Amino acid sequence: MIAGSMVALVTPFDAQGRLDWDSLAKLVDFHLQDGTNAIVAVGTTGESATLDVEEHIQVVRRVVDQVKGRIPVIAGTGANSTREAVALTEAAKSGGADACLLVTPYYNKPTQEGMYQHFRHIAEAVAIPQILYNVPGRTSCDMLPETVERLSKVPNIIGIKEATGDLQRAKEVIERVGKDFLVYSGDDATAVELMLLGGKGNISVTANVAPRAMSDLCAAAMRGDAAAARAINDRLMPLHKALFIESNPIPVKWALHEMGLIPEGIRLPLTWLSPHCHDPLRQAMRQTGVLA
Amino acid sequence: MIAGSMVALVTPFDAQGRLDWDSLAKLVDFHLQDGTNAIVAVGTTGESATLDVEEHIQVVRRVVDQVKGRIPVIAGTGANSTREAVALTEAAKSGGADACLLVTPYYNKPTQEGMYQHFRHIAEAVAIPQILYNVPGRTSCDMLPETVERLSKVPNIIGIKEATGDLQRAKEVIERVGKDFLVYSGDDATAVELMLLGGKGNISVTANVAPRAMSDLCAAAMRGDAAAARAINDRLMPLHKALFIESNPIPVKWALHEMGLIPEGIRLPLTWLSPHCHDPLRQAMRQTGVLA
């Protein structure tokens, strides 16, 4: 049941930076009410980097217990150490997640072969669906198509999150893999086109603030209605952009706080949306009707 | 104490991937023997990404206890999470390291201000010398010259390991900082030019296999003997190149095992030097006199 608009959920912290379960619950009800298809908990937008292993499973567990099978809950469990990816992945599983999102090793720059062995091992170590995650703009390494196809043959690897924002690349992963290997967008601005070429969804930041509009956009795209897709899309386009004027999730939390859904909390090394960027993001929210 | 030829020491693993203390000992004796200026334990080349915290202190502690205070011992303690960086930094201090090496946040892409707050916190939080590390080609982010000058004014942030290999950049940092803030090289091939420009050292990978040559190179370079430095350097040049035929530390470990100094053990997601790179690196080692 994993596809369409999948919010890359933020982890709300109170002013002190401590986890805030009340806000966590409203964001889930928010997405349970407005049509979100899946919730990705504790991934990049959820500030995976600055969470104890302890806070990490507890966020997975409360989203899973709150969702009650009504929607898939995918947990971020990638790490740049294969052993740790196994452990975090094992933790998500016996935690309730329906699948795990695993970013490619970042800082150590593995060879293409090392990336295959890395993911094949996790896939073989833990009985739980696993989605790959390619984002060279952060990891400083790129999983090439040939490596994806190799991985696409592995039993538990159900799909990939392509974030380069490159359509030529996406098309290329789609031509090389089976119909049963799902390709997701990791780029909010061009997700619509990825879906028209065969993609099966969007793991988005934009869905944080416009869930309903993003599931409408995905359904259209994934149903062939290229005209509705690009129309919702160009209407959302300034939010897409504004949501990135500073590294994510610095902006999305600002918005989320402005709609009264989360406290002003973020953990170092992240900062709060710096003052000079407030009004552009504010303008984009008003035009887009997410803020009045 | 801290400058000159500073080997970015590898952490030896046996064939099953367990720490090898005897082999760590020889590497320490080797460097104490062949004149290495300082030892950086558990940094990037020491495969920090794949070491429990248990192993992290076990290694720092063992190098320190063997060094017996004759040479400085810098431990890697950076993390993309400010709290984890303090943690690792504290373990290092209360472990005997003389200084700590801290790479910038690698996947969350913090603002320049965020990088300042982050490093400022670590420096106030733990009474121990701290060196910044900037290597955008891994971290997907770049600390700007203005952020280095600001951090250079913090009490115990003693220097920076600039790895871009961009000399315009090195000059700028040198020109901006006080002369009690030291700039070290993070790019073996251009370290000579960095020191000739005002730099104070090379946290070297090539030093793993040629401690003596790199020590002499650094001495000339840091004296002002440009002609001697560059001569040692174009001589070493094919080793510099070969040692990166695949993401470091993959090549350097191969070299070290061919030399009889460490086992054939590397941790996933890394792989052992792929078959097609063996002879080019063997050739470079023989050309430089490291292997007969």
d(CA A1, CA B206): 52
Q: Between A108, A137, A269, which is nearest B118 by CB?
A: A269
Instruction: List the one residue out of B243, B196, B246 whose CA is nearest residue B219.
Output: B196
Q: Between B110, B139, B271, which is nearest A270 by CB?
A: B110
Query: Position A85: which residue type?
Result: A
Q: What is the distance in angstroms between the Cα of B94 and the nearest Cα belonging to chain A?
A: 22
Instruction: List the one residue out of B257, B264, B253 whose CA is nearest residue B205.
Output: B253
What 3-state class would DSSP assign to A134? strand
The radius of gyration computed from the CA coordinates of chain B, to the nearest angstrom, equals: 18
User: Virtual CA dihedral for A196, A201, A206, A210, nearest 10 degrees?
Assistant: 90
d(CA A184, CA B46): 35
Q: What angle do CA B217, B222, B224 make, to 5 degrees?
A: 100
For an interface test with A, the pick among B11, B16, B111, B142 (most A C-beta atoms closer than 10 Å) comes out as B111
Contact predicate A38/A207, CB 8 Å? no
Structural biology method used: X-ray
Sign of CA dihedral A175, A181, A182, A183: negative
Token pair belonging to A75: 């947990």
d(CA B194, CA B232): 15
Flag if B113 and A47 touch (Cβ within 8 Å): no
Contact predicate A11/A19, CB 8 Å? yes
Q: Considering only CB atoms, which chain A residues are within 8 Å of B139?
A: 107, 140
Flag if A47 and B268 touch (Cβ within 8 Å): no
Q: What angle do CA A130, A135, A138 make, to 5 degrees?
A: 125
What total number of domains does chain B contain?
1
Residue B179 known to be catalytic: no
Q: Which of A93, A116, A133, A253 is catalytic?
A: A133
Instruction: List the one residue out of A129, A136, A84 whose CA is nearest residue A106.
Output: A136
Q: Considering only CB atoms, which chain B residues are within 8 Å of A109?
A: 138, 247
What 3-state class would DSSP assign to A15? coil
Distances (CA, A) of A85 to A101, A149, B45, B146, B269: 10, 21, 21, 36, 10
Please list the residues that pair with B185 across neighbouring strands: B162, B202
Contact predicate B36/B207, CB 8 Å? yes
What 3-state class would DSSP assign to A78? coil
Contact predicate B10/B39, CB 8 Å? no
Contact predicate A146/A174, CB 8 Å? no
Flag if B108 and A47 touch (Cβ within 8 Å): yes
Q: Could you count the other beta carbons within 10 Å of the beta carbon of residue B178?
A: 9
Q: What angle do CA B128, B133, B139 make, to 5 degrees?
A: 130
Please list the residues that pair with B159 across neighbouring strands: B131, B182
Chain B residue at shortest CA distance from A136: B140
Please list the residues that pair with A159 across neighbouring strands: A131, A182
* Block residue for tokens 């050309």: B287
A-to-B residue pairs, Cβ atoms closer than 8 angstroms? 125
**Residue A204 host element (H or E):** strand A201-204
Query: Position A194: which residue type?
Result: L
Flag if A111 and B49 touch (Cβ within 8 Å): no
d(CA B130, CA B124): 11
Peptide linkage before A249 cis (omega within 30 of 0): yes
Query: Position A292: which residue type?
Result: A
Residue B184 known to be catalytic: no
Q: Could you count the other beta carbons within 10 Å of the beta carbon of residue A17?
A: 14
In chain A the first and final C-alpha atoms are separated, in Å, by 34
d(CA A246, CA A136): 17
d(CA A10, CA A256): 9
Instruction: List the one residue out of A65, A61, A4, A6 whose CA is nearest residue A223.
Output: A4
d(CA A244, CA B81): 21
HEC per residue, A39-70: EEECCCCCCHHHCCHHHHHHHHHHHHHHHCCC
HEC per residue, chain B: CCCEEEEECCCCECCCCCECHHHHHHHHHHHHHCCCCEEEECCCCCCHHHCCHHHHHHHHHHHHHHHCCCCCEEEECCCCCHHHHHHHHHHHHCCCCCEEEEECCCCCCCCHHHHHHHHHHHHHHCCCCEEEEECHHHHCCCCCHHHHHHHCCCCCEEEEEECCCCHHHHHHHHHHCCCCCEEEECCCCCHHHHHHCCCCEEEECHHHCCHHHHHHHHHHHHHCCHHHHHHHHHHHHHHHHHCCCCCCCHHHHHHHHHCCCCCCCCCCCCCCCCHHHHHHHHHHHHHHCCCC
Q: Considering only CB atoms, which chain B residues are within 8 Å of A274?
A: 111, 113
- The CATH number covering residue A50 comes to 3.20.20.70
d(CA A88, CA A90): 5
Question: Max CA-CA distance within chain A?
Answer: 51
Given resolution (angstroms): 2.7
Residue B241: domain span: 1-292
Determine the length of chain B.
292
DSSP symbol at A79? -
Q: Considering only CB atoms, which chain B residues are within 8 Å of A44?
A: 107-108
Instruction: List the one residue out of B270, B269, B80 whose CA is nearest residue A86.
Output: B269
What 3-state class would DSSP assign to A160? strand
Q: Please state the φ and ψ torsions of residue B73, each to the nearest 5 degrees.
A: -130, 105
E-strand ranges in A48-167 read 73-76, 99-103, 130-134, 157-162
d(CA A88, CA A199): 27
